[PDB]
Amino acid sequence: PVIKVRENEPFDVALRRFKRSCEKAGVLAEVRRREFYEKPTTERKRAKASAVKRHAKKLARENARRTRLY
Amino acid sequence: TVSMRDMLKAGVHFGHQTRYWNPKMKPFIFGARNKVHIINLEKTVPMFNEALAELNKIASRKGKILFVGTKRAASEAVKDAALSCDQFFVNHRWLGGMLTNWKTVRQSIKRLKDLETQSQDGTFDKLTKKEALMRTRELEKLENSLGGIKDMGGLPDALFVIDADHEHIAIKEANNLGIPVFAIVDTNSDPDGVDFVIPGNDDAIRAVTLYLGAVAATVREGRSQ
Amino acid sequence: ELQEKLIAVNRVSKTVKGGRIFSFTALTVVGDGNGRVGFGYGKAREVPAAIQKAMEKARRNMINVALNNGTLQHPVKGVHTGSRVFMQPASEGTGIIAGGAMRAVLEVAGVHNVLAKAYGSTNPINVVRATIDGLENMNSPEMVAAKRGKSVEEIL
Amino acid sequence: KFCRFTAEGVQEIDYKDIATLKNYITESGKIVPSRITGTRAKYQRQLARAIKRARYLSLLPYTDRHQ
RNA sequence: CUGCAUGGCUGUCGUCAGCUCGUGUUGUGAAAUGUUGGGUUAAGUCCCGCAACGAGCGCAACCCUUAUCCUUUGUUGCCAG
RNA sequence: AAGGCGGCCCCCUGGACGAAGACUGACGCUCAGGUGCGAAAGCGUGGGGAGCAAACAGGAUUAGAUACCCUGGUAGUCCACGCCGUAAACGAUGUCGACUUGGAGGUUGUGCCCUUGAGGCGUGGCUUCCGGAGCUAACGCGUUAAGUCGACCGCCUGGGGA
Ligand SMILES: [Mg+2]
Ligand SMILES: [Mg+2]
Ligand SMILES: [Mg+2]
Ligand SMILES: [Mg+2]
Ligand SMILES: [Mg+2]
Ligand SMILES: [Mg+2]
Ligand SMILES: [Mg+2]
């Protein structure tokens, strides 16, 4: 991403904008999974393990609204 | 009275959302309305009248009717109506084993007899004020939970449940003992643990006021024999 | 008054941080020579306390059986978790031809002539429940006539 | 949000449109996921094909950097 | 001599906070609940919810001094006047 | 169908689902023996080979390490034509038909109402999570059942030996 800083802009805010752009692009987070070979078996296992937790959280959110006042 | 017009004007016909309806109580459904169920007055009124007839008959039989309800909106009502009909009530959370573990209920009943007589005996003298106020709270909070069943003797002869779905444990205990039950069930309740089924709304100030006004009146109705 | 027989006593034990602790479980069956019969399962630290605890629960859980004058009405089968009991009526003088925990429960239920056979796991704890459920589910001529609308003479 | 294609009754999506299609690609040339766009699964699979067609025909860059 | 026969006594874990029982309930059963979960505390201390309800040894208090004030008695002590 | 399939385009083609129809008329289910397909690894011939990587060498750890940590590295993984029918080939749940409370979704089509906004009511196919009766030794299944039955095939009879 091009983060060419214009005039009258502090280096601090310029670097923060660059870091935010990198974070929203998610380039740094992709190397931690592209650094090694994940077998298709392992990838599918991770995907289902993440899907199971992803609606289990919503299931618990919608189920904890019945009892347990505080 | 038993008036369907009174029930409709109070708001008994309302129920709960259609996603919580119990599948075993649909004959008592008038039809969905904005994802909210509506009960049947044409079916609620006759069953309620028959239950009131049986209740006043069993009251003339000199039976100990116990009201039980832990709702916060109908908290003071089930007490002001139980005092009117000269009967017994439980208003706080149902202590599991109140009916089955009657030996320990009587033991607690006598604990809050010795402690009750402590107030008369001015025994708040053989101990300083910290001792005295601790004992004062020990009766205050011990009475505010089981005070409606102090002068009751043994097990009640009939039960009247404000909401069967919430107080399902009391339904089970009463069925195990062999005590007749008149429970106010709703669209999300289970009308299978009760021999007498009372359809209609269960969480409404006006609805519970009408129910209590009918029950207490018929109980005094039967007592005056 | 009422007759009672305890069938088997066990020596179940638990394990704790400081070792293993012991306990006793007693199975008893109570009856009165008639259709009333019940079973109880008490748990205590010693055999007399266990049997005395089981007796009270048996008495409070007694159930009624529509037996005949000296036998049962019709052959029946009872299916529990691990026990499959099959009982059938017999004639005068045959006796109670049953084994395991079924003999005691039949004797306290009052049936004098009966032939019983158990298949599966013959443990007393399960076979007692199996035979109690089989005896409680049997029908009588009067009950079947009432439920069908016919008469006992018609359905003979 | 809501599927604007269904809201406006857009039956088909053509790669030749760029002014109203750039809204579905990030500044890095990556496709905005459905969980962020608010688009149905019927039209996400057609938006992806249109974006791929535009990338092939040099209408939308694959990424910010190419050379 | 034998604390590898013991009584009595003592130290540590540790004034750490847990250790159990009665009834009831649940599971065919071994067994579980109570004792778990949120707040809170020094704590199984208190509350709420929850088939749990209660009880014992238990966490505190009741025991001994200090900290404001009252009365009684005034010697071997105080000198307000 | 299973195994398994992921930029885009072109050509051939199999299968699946829906409103309203028309048409033959039991032509329907299963199926020993047989036939075909069938992960990867492996073998033969002809090619290619960037990266990865059995065997192999070296380095490191360890009392020892013919291994896990590292640097290389051939077969192989890439293509065409041939051989095997082997997997935890799993949903450890065979194929087909009917019935049995409910809730919250995903995907796909259609009907209707004023569609002013994925407004509202219905209706079929696939699929996902709870959950009642019931079943089970219990975990658990639970309208896609492991609930009750019907038709058929295959398999099981103590653990080793095997
Ligand atoms: Mg807590
Ligand atoms: Mg291969
Ligand atoms: Mg290597
Ligand atoms: Mg080496
Ligand atoms: Mg298999
Ligand atoms: Mg076939
Ligand atoms: Mg389920």
Side-chain angles (χ1 to χ4, degrees):
Chain A
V2 279
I3 324 291
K4 44 176 299 301
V5 51
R6 64 191 65 89
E7 64 178 4
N8 301 330
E9 281 194 352
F11 170 82
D12 199 335
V13 75
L15 184 136
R16 184 50 57 96
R17 185 193 309 268
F18 168 70
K19 184 180 301 180
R20 188 184 301 102
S21 180
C22 293
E23 176 182 351
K24 72 178 180 60
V27 52
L28 184 139
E30 199 70 19
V31 193
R32 282 144 180 79
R33 69 178 301 269
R34 291 187 174 275
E35 55 180 357
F36 292 104
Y37 172 81
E38 295 82 55
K39 296 184 177 182
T41 300
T42 305
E43 176 64 28
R44 286 189 286 100
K45 170 185 174 300
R46 297 302 178 182
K48 185 200 306 186
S50 179
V52 166
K53 290 183 173 300
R54 193 253 295 272
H55 61 78
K57 51 175 291 300
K58 303 190 63 178
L59 181 60
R61 178 96 297 181
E62 294 295 333
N63 190 28
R65 308 293 183 177
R66 304 288 85 90
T67 51
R68 200 63 55 185
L69 283 70
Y70 192 84
Chain B
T1 174
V2 179
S3 188
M4 56 176 300
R5 300 302 178 181
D6 295 0
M7 297 179 180
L8 190 145
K9 293 179 181 59
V12 186
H13 56 282
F14 292 147
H16 291 186
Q17 289 186 307
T18 181
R19 62 172 301 180
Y20 312 107
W21 82 292
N22 189 268
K24 298 178 298 182
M25 200 182 173
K26 183 178 179 180
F28 304 96
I29 303 300
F30 185 79
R33 183 70 59 86
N34 299 329
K35 311 289 288 180
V36 179
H37 282 287
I38 298 181
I39 53 100
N40 300 132
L41 300 180
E42 297 81 6
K43 305 299 297 181
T44 301
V45 174
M47 303 183 66
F48 192 21
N49 189 21
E50 192 274 343
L52 291 181
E54 177 63 28
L55 189 56
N56 58 66
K57 183 179 299 299
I58 207 174
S60 299
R61 288 196 182 99
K62 296 184 60 180
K64 293 173 294 181
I65 321 295
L66 188 142
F67 304 152
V68 175
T70 180
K71 289 301 174 300
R72 304 176 66 259
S75 59
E76 54 86 18
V78 299
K79 176 175 184 178
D80 298 2
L83 294 180
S84 179
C85 63
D86 304 330
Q87 288 292 342
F88 312 93
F89 69 100
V90 279
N91 193 26
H92 287 54
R93 185 189 66 89
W94 178 265
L95 304 180
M98 180 180 300
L99 300 181
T100 59
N101 207 5
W102 191 250
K103 49 179 302 301
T104 69
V105 176
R106 291 176 297 182
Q107 183 67 22
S108 180
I109 63 171
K110 300 178 180 59
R111 173 181 54 181
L112 200 68
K113 278 298 181 179
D114 197 324
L115 270 311
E116 182 67 24
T117 55
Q118 181 269 351
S119 297
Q120 298 180 357
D121 282 2
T123 358
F124 25 88
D125 80 292
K126 251 125 140 347
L127 25 112
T128 231
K129 297 186 301 179
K130 170 60 176 300
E131 297 85 357
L133 54 92
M134 287 194 302
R135 209 71 70 92
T136 303
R137 293 178 179 83
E138 288 176 343
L139 274 66
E140 176 71 16
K141 205 213 175 190
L142 189 147
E143 193 273 343
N144 285 270
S145 179
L146 63 80
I149 58 180
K150 46 180 58 180
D151 67 9
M152 206 173 64
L155 273 309
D157 196 61
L159 192 70
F160 181 79
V161 187
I162 305 302
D163 184 1
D165 53 353
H166 200 280
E167 289 275 344
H168 60 81
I169 172 178
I171 307 293
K172 185 179 183 179
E173 294 192 11
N175 284 270
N176 183 25
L177 289 191
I179 301 179
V181 187
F182 305 87
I184 304 175
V185 301
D186 202 0
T187 63
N188 64 327
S189 301
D190 196 328
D192 290 334
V194 288
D195 49 356
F196 293 88
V197 178
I198 302 302
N201 189 278
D202 56 355
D203 294 329
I205 44 179
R206 308 178 65 177
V208 72
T209 302
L210 263 64
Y211 281 122
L212 292 172
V215 167
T218 196
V219 165
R220 294 203 307 266
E221 183 178 2
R223 181 188 302 267
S224 300
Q225 181 69 18
Chain C
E1 317 182 79
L2 281 71
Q3 196 175 14
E4 54 190 14
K5 295 185 183 62
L6 61 80
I7 293 178
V9 48
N10 200 12
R11 195 186 144 86
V12 299
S13 176
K14 207 212 303 297
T15 306
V16 81
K17 179 181 179 180
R20 49 173 57 92
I21 56 182
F22 301 146
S23 297
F24 289 87
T25 54
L27 183 61
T28 62
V29 59
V30 299
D32 61 330
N34 286 20
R36 298 192 57 85
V37 62
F39 79 103
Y41 186 88
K43 184 182 184 63
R45 195 57 186 269
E46 206 180 359
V47 288
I51 63 180
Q52 291 177 0
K53 177 58 58 180
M55 289 301 182
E56 190 273 343
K57 281 186 293 181
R59 290 187 179 95
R60 81 180 307 272
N61 203 261
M62 292 182 65
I63 203 61
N64 183 24
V65 180
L67 84 172
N68 204 333
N69 56 332
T71 180
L72 179 63
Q73 302 291 342
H74 61 78
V76 81
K77 54 181 180 180
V79 179
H80 203 254
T81 61
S83 300
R84 302 174 183 88
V85 297
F86 174 80
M87 296 167 292
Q88 61 178 359
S91 60
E92 186 280 335
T94 304
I96 306 177
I97 309 304
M102 302 181 301
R103 175 187 180 91
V105 307
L106 292 177
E107 183 176 359
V108 304
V111 280
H112 292 69
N113 307 279
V114 52
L115 313 177
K117 191 61 181 59
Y119 306 102
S121 65
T122 189
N123 59 330
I125 302 97
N126 290 116
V127 76
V128 166
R129 306 178 67 93
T131 182
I132 286 301
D133 196 9
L135 288 175
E136 201 269 349
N137 295 21
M138 72 183 302
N139 300 271
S140 61
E142 299 81 6
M143 191 62 178
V144 67
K147 76 174 185 179
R148 288 176 54 182
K150 297 301 180 301
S151 65
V152 290
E153 206 284 331
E154 281 175 340
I155 45 179
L156 73 162
Chain D
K1 206 63 62 180
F2 63 94
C3 183
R4 181 162 285 98
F5 296 153
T6 59
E8 205 184 16
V10 183
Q11 179 63 32
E12 302 294 335
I13 293 89
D14 57 82
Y15 60 92
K16 300 176 296 299
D17 201 331
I18 302 302
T20 65
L21 203 70
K22 189 182 297 298
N23 306 329
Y24 296 95
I25 52 178
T26 61
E27 196 67 24
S28 179
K30 316 182 61 179
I31 295 178
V32 298
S34 180
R35 57 176 55 91
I36 307 300
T37 58
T39 312
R40 294 176 56 92
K42 184 183 177 180
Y43 293 85
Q44 182 70 17
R45 299 173 296 187
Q46 300 179 358
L47 169 68
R49 183 176 294 101
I51 293 174
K52 292 163 179 181
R53 300 288 182 268
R55 292 169 179 171
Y56 182 84
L57 284 178
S58 180
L59 297 180
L60 298 178
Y62 288 87
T63 51
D64 190 13
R65 59 176 182 183
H66 284 268
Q67 289 83 19

